Write a protein that holds these residues in place. Structure first.
Motif, PDB file in Angstrom:
ATOM      1  N   UNK A 149       6.392 -18.226   0.453  1.00 55.98           N
ATOM      2  CA  UNK A 149       4.738 -19.038   0.191  1.00 55.98           C
ATOM      3  C   UNK A 149       3.553 -17.570  -0.344  1.00 55.98           C
ATOM      4  N   UNK A 150       2.815 -17.830   0.118  1.00 50.36           N
ATOM      5  CA  UNK A 150       1.600 -17.383   0.149  1.00 50.36           C
ATOM      6  C   UNK A 150       0.352 -16.748   0.551  1.00 50.36           C
ATOM      7  N   UNK A 151      -0.305 -15.711   1.442  1.00 48.70           N
ATOM      8  CA  UNK A 151      -1.605 -15.097   2.027  1.00 48.70           C
ATOM      9  C   UNK A 151      -2.178 -14.351   1.340  1.00 48.70           C
ATOM     10  N   UNK A 152      -3.302 -14.472   1.843  1.00 51.03           N
ATOM     11  CA  UNK A 152      -4.551 -13.194   0.994  1.00 51.03           C
ATOM     12  C   UNK A 152      -5.915 -13.077   2.129  1.00 51.03           C
ATOM     13  N   UNK A 153      -6.293 -12.167   2.197  1.00 52.68           N
ATOM     14  CA  UNK A 153      -8.020 -11.768   3.240  1.00 52.68           C
ATOM     15  C   UNK A 153      -8.318 -11.326   2.366  1.00 52.68           C
ATOM     16  N   UNK A 154      -9.443 -11.631   2.366  1.00 50.02           N
ATOM     17  CA  UNK A 154     -11.330 -11.536   1.763  1.00 50.02           C
ATOM     18  C   UNK A 154     -11.621 -10.055   2.597  1.00 50.02           C
ATOM     19  N   UNK A 155     -10.897 -10.430   4.082  1.00 47.87           N
ATOM     20  CA  UNK A 155     -11.253  -8.881   4.650  1.00 47.87           C
ATOM     21  C   UNK A 155     -10.912  -7.937   3.891  1.00 47.87           C
ATOM     22  N   UNK A 156      -9.494  -7.722   3.779  1.00 45.61           N
ATOM     23  CA  UNK A 156      -9.202  -6.228   2.970  1.00 45.61           C
ATOM     24  C   UNK A 156      -9.425  -7.152   1.222  1.00 45.61           C
ATOM     25  N   UNK A 157      -9.320  -8.192   0.724  1.00 39.97           N
ATOM     26  CA  UNK A 157      -9.619  -8.693  -0.161  1.00 39.97           C
ATOM     27  C   UNK A 157      -7.497  -8.444  -1.037  1.00 39.97           C
ATOM     28  N   UNK A 158      -6.106  -8.598  -0.086  1.00 36.88           N
ATOM     29  CA  UNK A 158      -5.370  -8.467  -0.313  1.00 36.88           C
ATOM     30  C   UNK A 158      -3.970  -9.683  -0.553  1.00 36.88           C
ATOM     31  N   UNK A 159      -3.274  -9.866  -0.938  1.00 41.47           N
ATOM     32  CA  UNK A 159      -2.132 -10.535  -1.581  1.00 41.47           C
ATOM     33  C   UNK A 159      -1.899 -10.139   0.030  1.00 41.47           C
ATOM     34  N   UNK A 160      -0.719 -11.572   0.678  1.00 38.91           N
ATOM     35  CA  UNK A 160       0.013 -11.202   1.537  1.00 38.91           C
ATOM     36  C   UNK A 160       0.956 -11.960   0.647  1.00 38.91           C
ATOM     37  N   UNK A 161       2.003 -11.384   1.319  1.00 36.33           N
ATOM     38  CA  UNK A 161       3.483 -12.420   0.789  1.00 36.33           C
ATOM     39  C   UNK A 161       3.728 -12.994   2.137  1.00 36.33           C
ATOM     40  N   UNK A 162       5.236 -14.656   1.569  1.00 38.58           N
ATOM     41  CA  UNK A 162       5.853 -14.855   2.826  1.00 38.58           C
ATOM     42  C   UNK A 162       6.864 -15.355   1.560  1.00 38.58           C
ATOM     43  N   UNK A 163       7.912 -14.333   1.384  1.00 35.64           N
ATOM     44  CA  UNK A 163       8.934 -15.211   1.025  1.00 35.64           C
ATOM     45  C   UNK A 163      10.005 -13.711   0.083  1.00 35.64           C
ATOM     46  N   UNK A 164      10.582 -14.040  -0.727  1.00 33.33           N
ATOM     47  CA  UNK A 164      11.817 -13.356  -1.478  1.00 33.33           C
ATOM     48  C   UNK A 164      11.811 -12.352  -1.746  1.00 33.33           C
ATOM     49  N   UNK A 165      11.857 -11.000  -1.776  1.00 30.52           N
ATOM     50  CA  UNK A 165      12.039  -9.860  -2.551  1.00 30.52           C
ATOM     51  C   UNK A 165      12.678  -9.913  -4.146  1.00 30.52           C
ATOM     52  N   UNK A 166      12.716 -11.497  -4.648  1.00 29.96           N
ATOM     53  CA  UNK A 166      12.456 -12.121  -5.819  1.00 29.96           C
ATOM     54  C   UNK A 166      11.309 -12.371  -5.465  1.00 29.96           C
ATOM     55  N   UNK A 167      11.048 -13.187  -5.273  1.00 31.35           N
ATOM     56  CA  UNK A 167       9.153 -13.578  -4.679  1.00 31.35           C
ATOM     57  C   UNK A 167       8.559 -11.929  -4.765  1.00 31.35           C
TER      58      UNK A 167
END
Lengths: 48, 37
Positions: free
Chosen positions: A1-19
């Protein structure tokens, strides 16, 4: 699944190395910044 | 203004008489000048 932070403005990810492959692809895909549109304009009146 | 303030009844008030020019130009972005005079 998906995250991000707009402190950093950065995509975080939860999942595959295909993801990780495809979502580094989408890390890159929408990074682009639209060129300025001249949304506002100052016009010099000659006569009026 | 080149002139004089002279008082005038109304009471009284100070009114200016003489050579007086009050101008408000605005410039066409080149050459011609518009004058409210």
């Amino acid at each position: 699944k998906f995250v991000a932070d707009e402190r950093t403005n950065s995509i975080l990810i939860s999942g595959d190395p295909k993801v990780r492959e495809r979502l580094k692809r989408l890390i890159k895909q929408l990074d682009v910044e639209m060129a300025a549109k001249g949304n506002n304009r100052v016009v010099y009146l000659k006569y009026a | 203004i080149v002139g004089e303030e002279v008082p005038v009844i109304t009471t009284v008030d100070r009114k200016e008489v003489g050579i007086k020019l009050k101008v408000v130009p605005q410039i066409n972005e080149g050459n011609s000048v518009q004058l409210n005079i």
